[PDB]
Amino acid sequence: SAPPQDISCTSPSSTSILVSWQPPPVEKQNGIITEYSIKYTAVDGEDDKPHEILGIPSDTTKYLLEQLEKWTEYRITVTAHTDVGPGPESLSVLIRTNEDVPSGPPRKVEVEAVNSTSVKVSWRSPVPNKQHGQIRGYQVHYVRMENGEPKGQPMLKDVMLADAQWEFDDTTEHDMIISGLQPETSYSLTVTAYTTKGDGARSKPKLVSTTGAVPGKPRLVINHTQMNTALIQWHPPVDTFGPLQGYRLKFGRKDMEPLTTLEFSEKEDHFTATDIHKGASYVFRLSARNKVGFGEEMVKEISIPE
């Protein structure tokens, strides 16, 4: 006898497969067809047991398999029955149900401050058996926090993978800098992965704050003193953003490199520079530091008249 023909399987959802067939050629049948049956088995699935669709009407040539596993392969045959019994089963067809969105978050989310206007976030792909498809990209969500609660509107940055690193994305080490942020401000960051079907589960939010700002520029006062010296005095910036910790002075002949670098504590606010000769130009560059670091340098060049 002849089996069903025109076997056609398609997946309309991540958990379903539409099976289609036609009766065997009537000139090649024997008895009258009375029903169809389907055999379907998840290959490599959580449930590897064969399942069946029974009692399909003789005039019915399509049937929807449902409650299948997401993005999973199924091997399928169709069999025609007569009043005698079942005939030979069709050729075997294997297709995979559709992709879905990831049910797991990106793995290993880590955050850290960069400077006063930016933070860094790192992550890896979701657990492979929770992706439900080829990961196509990620979205980093971040919202400004105030007293432990979100204040501003959330923003996002989308990262889309290139075709070249679809295949090795489980080994790619992902990271992103978010800039354009406010000094000394807390942000709550989440990361999602996406497939073609859409966005998946979000990581558990992680807090990260930008650093504080560095101090403003100090003010320089310069005097010509005896024996080819100059008294270099300074005043702290009014904007220190916390306790000042010291100063850094770079000085020497103008354009002549390298300059001499000296550091001072916050308690010191003058220095006598030596080898300051009449008829030459000298540069002084002074920055102030807090625990974050040094602010911009106040830069002054002086020329001693002859």
Author numbering: 610 to 915
Article passage:
We sought to gain further insights into the position of the conserved KGD motif in mammalian homologues of Dlar. The three-domain fragment adopts an extended conformation, but the KGD sequence lies at the interface between domains FN4 and FN5, which makes the tripeptide unavailable for binding to integrins. (D) The crystal structure of domains FN4-FN6 of human RPTPδ is shown in a ribbon representation and colored green.
The ectodomains of Lar-RPTPs resemble immunoglobulin (Ig)-superfamily CAMs and include three Ig-like domains followed by four to nine fibronectin type III (FN) repeats.
